[PDB]
Amino acid sequence: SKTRYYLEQCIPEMDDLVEKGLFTKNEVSLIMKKRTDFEHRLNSRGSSINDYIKYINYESNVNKLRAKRCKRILQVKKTNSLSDWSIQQRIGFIYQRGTNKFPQDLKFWAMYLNYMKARGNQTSYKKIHNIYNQLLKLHPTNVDIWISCAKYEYEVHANFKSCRNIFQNGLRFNPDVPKLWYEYVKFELNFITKLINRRKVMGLINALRGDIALTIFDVCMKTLGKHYINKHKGYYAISDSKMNIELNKETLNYLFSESLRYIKLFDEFLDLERDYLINHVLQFWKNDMYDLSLRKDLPELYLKTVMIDITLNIRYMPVEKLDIDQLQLSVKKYFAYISKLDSASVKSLKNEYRSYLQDNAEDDPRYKILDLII
């Protein structure tokens, strides 16, 4: 039997752990009968990931007791013998066995990754790379594993090339969830922000732009639109032109709501050229979307983008020097909108007035602003 093999693999560490005079024979027999129970429950039939988890918790508890007893008996913090790594190696092998048997519970896979990362200097980052590789092989569609893999290899190791490779491979696998798109534009903005801040720092002590984020923004719009028109209206295109235009309108609503979220969490990256990097998404949304977002319905979205293009310089604090510089730009925007619109004219006028009043002695310059926007 293989429980016999594993149990007698456990004996040299307790040889060493009895020789180093911290445990006695009668208590190490007790930890062996508990470990016998656990090994038999592991490699018998009807096994459970809770059996694996309880074995890992028991082995961590006897490791903590071993460390406590070592500090109290020998008054060293490690005996530099077999019995201080064998038990963590055992926990790692219980994790490997469990993930080979039940490779379906991401709770257990993430407990494996957490213990392997928190093992510290003693583990190897290529050993973490191996279990990231096989986990991403088994779950390519689950996207938080791609985010966690790239987050470990950028926010700990700062490996930009491999992080870009992870994000491009994940976007190859599931180019359908917008969350991976948003985390990729987030990673690219974080990388370019660290690039220009190390430039600023080398200047203060002693070309490559957000156009990467704009290009992945562009392919984000194109492929998310393609995958929504392929996901809905699923089997066939058996739908008349009313249902086809209803579908295409709804995909425009979907994609434009995601770009609204993109600008909403795009504004807080204010260390690069945030005006240019928001204005390029503005000009990428301003063009035609093949179903007349401006010249027909989604006119509310056209008014939303017009309000964004108006306040895109007026994204400011109550110190309104930019307003005193270019509020005539907002007035010309309201005039150019009300020169064409019918109820969106009154809506945009009242909305820009309410927005400027809410956002903006100090009340006397604000009395000038109220007389301006009255």
Partner: protein, 461 residues
Amino acid sequence: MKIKTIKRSADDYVPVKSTQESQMPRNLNPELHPFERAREYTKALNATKLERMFAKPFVGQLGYGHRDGVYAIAKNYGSLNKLATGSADGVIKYWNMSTREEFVSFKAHYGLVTGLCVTQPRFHDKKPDLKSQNFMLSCSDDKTVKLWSINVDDYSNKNNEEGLIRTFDGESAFQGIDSHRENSTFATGGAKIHLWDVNRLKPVSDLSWGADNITSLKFNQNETDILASTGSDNSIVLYDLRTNSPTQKIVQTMRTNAICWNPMEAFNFVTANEDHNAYYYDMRNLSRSLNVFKDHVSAVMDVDFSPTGDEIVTGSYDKSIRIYKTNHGHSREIYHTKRMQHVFQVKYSMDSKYIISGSDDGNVRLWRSKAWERSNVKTTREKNKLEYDEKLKERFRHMPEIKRISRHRHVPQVIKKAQEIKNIELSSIKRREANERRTRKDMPYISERKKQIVGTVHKYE
């Protein structure tokens, strides 16, 4: 008074949930396990009896055989299941041994196809397509060497002009052929041994010791530039292709039918000759064989090595084949059949698990090298039982009761009667040489391993 009894507690010994197996506590005390010699003696005896009832070695013949008896066989040393065979009526065939059916047949020559081997032909104008074409070339007594390509369904990468891509031509007949394992080269023995390459239509070099013909040929498998050949003047000649010359020859008593080189030791080879035994020779010292494999009763026709280099197979003119462990010198196993006549060709498949024999009634037959061994994949319990039984038969090997069972086979009537009259003849000559040695003064004790070399060029010091 303190007091303590055995608390068995029933949670550790019969499990709570019904889906899981019972605990098996062990206790390795020899007091607990008493008959440790008798118990594994009986397990070794039951293993030898189980082997003698599981010995079913004949897998199957392949195809419908040939029409006129198989005189040439060649495996290809890179694919597991492909086999080329040629008969006396000039037909050669290429075989898929998985389905036991021919890829193609070819009326190759008019005489006997006297040799055939396989190639990866290194042309320097074309590129060899070895994933869809296989190449076999073949020499006959109508003074021709022909090279053929075969359409092979082993990869499904592609989607074609199969036969006879070229025709080398000699002035006299050919008798053997073997291909170099690189560099587009082969060698043909016959009236004289020539070296060839697949580009030139004529021999590159004639490498003949004297004006005595050559009956067989084998290239080395590692140190690939060392050839060996058997000439009908009872001679075994080694050639080297760096020096482009012969190297050393020995003359034996009778005629070497075949050679095969050891694929794992690169200087050892085995010869199969007409006095009924095989000789294991070292290339660096041909003054003595380093084994003699004795158990055949007629002329040994062909020999081959296991690709593990650990055992040889040996088919002879008595209609039977024999498998020999390389360190022993007597037969580990004999395969016979009432349908098999005069096994002229034997190869050992690259799996090291099957043995291909070409007989002369026409048929090519598969056998298991280990008769009692099945070819399924095994769970660890049965794999552990099988290697436990192998180790146990090994360490009880010489007990009389299991030795008489493992030693036992059914041999035909003709081979059994030849065996017993061979025994009484050998016992008579040992009696007479013991008497003659008792009288006469200086009778040298010649070794069995030297008793079959009449001489050697390039003497040893």
